[PDB]
Amino acid sequence: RDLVGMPKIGLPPDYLDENAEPEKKAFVQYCKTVVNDMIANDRAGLIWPRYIDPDTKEDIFEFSLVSRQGAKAYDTGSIIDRYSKQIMMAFMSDVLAMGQSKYGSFSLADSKTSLLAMSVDI
Amino acid sequence: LPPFRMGEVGSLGLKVKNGRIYEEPRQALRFPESIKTFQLMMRDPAVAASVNIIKMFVRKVNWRFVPPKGKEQDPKMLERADFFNSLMDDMEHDWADFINSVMSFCTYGFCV
């Protein structure tokens, strides 16, 4: 659901009416096609109308990508790794992640047996 | 002061009250509540692993009956050792199971 960076189109309310003139309907259909089919490409570009209202000084049309301010408060990777290591510790089976070290052995007749082998003996 | 005398003069000084030991002041760690608190602690992976390694180490060992020192080669002591060794395997349950049940005191601190 991370939605940062998606395109957004702003149009005057009268463009979205059902009885609007054919020109506005064609404009809305073209906007829909653009939204559906725009991708990063060697021909990417836009020609967009631009009009700033004299009494508000804000563009009536707009084209921009949604932005976000804050950042996630928790790092999930570290927590997941910690809990995985905790799970692996319960069975004393850390060999799965740390490999077979030379200081441990799987033989019960050898004086380097690991805890996993000792419990399998039980 | 009273003169020296053979035999006990004092007492252990335990805090038993109406048959219940009151050594531990925290209510959460006395008899009625300790059955649940200890079971809550065993759910943590760290405590569980620490207890289980100790339990595993004890169960790895073998047991045997031997003559008392100073009379190792006496045939009578050898026959006594044989009798007591045979006693171990004649129970309704295996000796290893008995040793397993004994290790419950790693959690509650005692066993009967």
Automatic annotation (TrEMBL), chain B:
Domain of life: Viruses
Record protein name field: Portal protein
Residue window of the full protein shown: 11 to 122 of 488
